[PDB]
Design a protein around this nucleic acid. Structure first.
Ligand SMILES: [Mg+2]
Ligand SMILES: [Mg+2]
Ligand SMILES: [Mg+2]
Ligand SMILES: [Mg+2]
Ligand SMILES: [Mg+2]
Ligand SMILES: [Mg+2]
Ligand SMILES: [Mg+2]
Ligand SMILES: [Mg+2]
Ligand SMILES: [Mg+2]
Ligand SMILES: [Mg+2]
Ligand SMILES: [Mg+2]
Ligand SMILES: [Mg+2]
Ligand SMILES: [Mg+2]
Ligand SMILES: [Mg+2]
Ligand SMILES: [Mg+2]
Ligand SMILES: [Mg+2]
Ligand SMILES: [Mg+2]
Ligand SMILES: [Mg+2]
Ligand SMILES: [Mg+2]
Ligand SMILES: [Mg+2]
Ligand SMILES: [Mg+2]
Ligand SMILES: [Mg+2]
Ligand SMILES: [Mg+2]
Ligand SMILES: [Mg+2]
Lengths: 62, 151, 50, 205
RNA sequence: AAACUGCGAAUGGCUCAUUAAAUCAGUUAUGGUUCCUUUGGUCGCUCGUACUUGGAUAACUGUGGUAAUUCU
RNA sequence: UGGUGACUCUAGAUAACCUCGGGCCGAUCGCACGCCGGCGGCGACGACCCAUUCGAACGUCUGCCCUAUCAACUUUCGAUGGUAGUCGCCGUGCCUACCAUGGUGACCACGGGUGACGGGGAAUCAGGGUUCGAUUCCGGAGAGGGAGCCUGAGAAACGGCUACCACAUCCAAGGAAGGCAGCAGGCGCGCAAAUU
RNA sequence: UCGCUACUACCGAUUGGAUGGUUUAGUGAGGCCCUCGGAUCGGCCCCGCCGGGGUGCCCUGGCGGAGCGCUGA
């Protein structure tokens, strides 16, 4: 006799392997935990700090 | 009273009347201060404007217009329009071939502030140019000189 | 009638050609952007929602 | 579309002229924006030069100056009482410049009673509420009571205005043209004009 | 390369049908207005995730349709 | 405070206002690399608003060929003016509402005609004129005829669009696409005019 | 004057025909404006179940299931 209902449909983002990184690599970096990432970050940060003060000494040398 | 003819209230847009006062100053008198401006070319703004009670927005003195442009003169012929008159300017147009002039004339519709009055057909009126007031009216009456036979 | 069918999550397509009046019976009198399960479409489809 | 051009027209004498050019953009007229009282509705138009003209289809609030005591408050508009131009325009309640309009007394009476600490438009029944008595009767300090008392000589109001407050509705007039402007803003009718317009609207009956 | 964006396409070129205080010429005004650009001015004057924020779309990949297009 | 021949100018102070179809305040780019974990040089775009330039748009004064076998004309549907508005980028019967009854005309209005775009100019000339100026500069109009809009700083644009009329192209008959008064060139017209 | 031949314009029924220009009236494509309309496309909530964090709850995450909830385009 009438329609009172307005349907609400949902949008879902699935996962696909992106060319050059297969779904195993995406999930390998995604599921990586806070200890691993924090270690990598602080290590790269300190390597970069060393290279940078080395290049500051290489600025004052020239 | 008698100043307000029209449906709308008749004001002098740049003056604020309703400024409040003591009941000792309300008993003294109500004189709403005129706005009048001195028009520039050395026409002394008539006495009848600065004292006078009338309100006309398009008058050069008591209202909003600025007189800039040509300044012309003519003679009054027909006044049946309200706050405007028709004046005619005569002149001689030279025809080269014949080496002589022919007479010619043009009719101007021009607005006239209610301060000037007793302006009588056939007398000299000097007008000055304004921004367009109406369809045919681009001018404004700056000063009125009587005809040669005034008593 | 040809059907142009698309799997979003897989990211693929196929062009299918359907001549059956029933299979289209399910689709007639339908607006765009409405969900119909594909049943009459074939044996394989079944629980497939289109 | 609608051309506000001058060349469709008789001469000063009245001979019709044959138009030399077909209609030009800049001579365009737009449709009339009539403005009604309701919940706020506004449509931006892009005009010559690329500037925004703000057009008002429905208005509610407008702000107004109570000029005597020199204040201005943001008020709610109620009704169109009078229009010099057109009676038809009163009937449909249309807001144009210089039509005349009823507004809420409220924010004014509040300001006033805060400034002068005096009763305004209150019934002779005199019935009051706690906030009212604490604002009006209040408490003072010596320098304070002298200030307020010094202003009490000043504040007295035209009997007409006084009445208006008692009714809750003030008579005002709109100086801004909502049609192009986007706001209906204006001033309270005081004194001579107020008495005048009152005479016109009593004359409307 | 393409495609998005920005800008230009209102100039220039052609013709003389209309058009008789109209166009137009000299003359003046805009204190009655709009102005991309260019040139100079302004651009911590406001007292109330930032070592960087949100979503989408074109080219591109692909599946297509129509006799037909600078269609989609 | 400053300015004009003259402002209801510019600047100042007070009360408020501020559009969801929103105003300003840089979430941007490059090249050099240097200085005491911090500092910065040159540029590129942007940007509200002044001012300026190119203008544009409306007004002022004076000026046009023939015609009386056109003498009165305009005004219920704006003619002329008044008052308040609407619209517009603003001044204005531009448009509405309400009043007034005006305005033009033998100094030739109004109407008709023009093998009429207006000028700068050309031909011819003792002095005076007469005739011509579609045509390379300046201004106006128009893109088959009318009308109506998008976009934009700027068009009522036609090498944009939407109709109707007139024309005409393609078609698988469902539909689609048109605009040389740009250059060439073709047809027609014609006494009359060039190379795809 | 009459007569013969030729050539021009004129009156002339035919409500003669054709074209152009205005326009009264009726009809009225198409844009623009207003009032609606609301196909669809989102966002926020509502819960269920589970994972991490913070203290039965709170902050998140991961899905899902659903309401004439209320908002934007
Ligand atoms: Mg600008
Ligand atoms: Mg492009
Ligand atoms: Mg540029
Ligand atoms: Mg600049
Ligand atoms: Mg493709
Ligand atoms: Mg008027
Ligand atoms: Mg006016
Ligand atoms: Mg009327
Ligand atoms: Mg011609
Ligand atoms: Mg000529
Ligand atoms: Mg010429
Ligand atoms: Mg030529
Ligand atoms: Mg030219
Ligand atoms: Mg044109
Ligand atoms: Mg042609
Ligand atoms: Mg542009
Ligand atoms: Mg066109
Ligand atoms: Mg062409
Ligand atoms: Mg062109
Ligand atoms: Mg050609
Ligand atoms: Mg031949
Ligand atoms: Mg030849
Ligand atoms: Mg009709
Ligand atoms: Mg229609």
């Amino acid at each position: 006799x009438x329609x009172x209902x307005x349907x609400x449909x949902x949008x879902x983002x699935x996962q696909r392997a992106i060319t050059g990184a297969s779904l195993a690599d995406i999930m390998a970096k995604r599921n990586q935990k806070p200890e691993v990432r924090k270690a990598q970050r602080e290590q790269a940060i300190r390597a970069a700090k060393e290279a940078k003060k080395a290049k500051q000494a290489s600025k004052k040398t020239a | 009273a008698d100043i307000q003819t029209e449906r709308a209230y008749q004001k002098q847009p740049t003056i604020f009347q309703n400024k409040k006062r003591v009941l000792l100053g309300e008993t003294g008198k109500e004189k709403l201060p005129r706005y009048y401006k001195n028009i520039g070319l050395g026409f002394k703004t008539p006495k009848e404007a600065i004292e006078g009670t009338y309100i006309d927005k398009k008058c050069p003195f008591t209202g909003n217009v600025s007189i800039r442009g040509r300044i012309l003169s003519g003679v009054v012929t027909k006044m049946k329009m309200q706050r405007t008159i028709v004046i005619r300017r005569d002149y001689l147009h030279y025809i080269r071939k014949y080496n002589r002039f022919e007479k010619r004339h043009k009719n101007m519709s021009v607005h006239l502030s209610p301060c000037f009055r007793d302006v009588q057909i056939g007398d000299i009126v000097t007008v000055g140019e304004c921004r367009p007031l109406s369809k045919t009216v681009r001018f404004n009456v700056l000063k009125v000189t009587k005809a040669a036979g005034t008593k | 009638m040809k059907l142009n069918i698309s799997f979003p999550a897989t990211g693929c397509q196929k062009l299918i050609e359907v001549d059956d009046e029933r299979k289209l019976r399910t689709f007639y009198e339908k607006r765009m952007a409405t969900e119909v399960a594909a049943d009459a479409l074939g044996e394989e489809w079944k629980g497939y929602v289109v | 579309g609608i051309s506000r051009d001058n060349w469709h027209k008789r001469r000063k004498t009245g001979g019709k002229r044959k138009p030399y050019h077909k209609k030009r953009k800049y001579e365009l007229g737009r449709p009339a924006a009539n403005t009604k009282i309701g919940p706020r509705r506004i449509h931006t138009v892009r005009v010559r030069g690329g500037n925004k003209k703000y057009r008002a289809l429905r208005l509610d609030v407008g702000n107004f100056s109570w000029g005597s005591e020199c204040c201005t408050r943001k008020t709610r508009i109620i009704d169109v009482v009078y229009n010099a131009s057109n009676n038809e325009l009163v009937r449909t309640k249309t807001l144009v410049k210089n039509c005349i309009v009823l507004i809420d007394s409220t924010p004014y009476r509040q300001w006033y009673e805060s400034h002068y600490a005096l009763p305004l438009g209150r019934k002779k029944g005199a019935k009051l509420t706690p906030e009212e008595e604490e604002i009006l009767n209040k408490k003072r300090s010596k320098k304070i009571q002298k200030k307020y008392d010094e202003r009490k000589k000043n504040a007295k109001i035209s009997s007409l205005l006084e009445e208006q407050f008692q009714q809750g509705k003030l008579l005002a007039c709109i100086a801004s043209r909502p049609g192009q402007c986007g706001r209906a803003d204006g001033y309270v009718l005081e004194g001579k004009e107020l008495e005048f317009y009152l005479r016109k609207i009593k004359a409307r009956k």
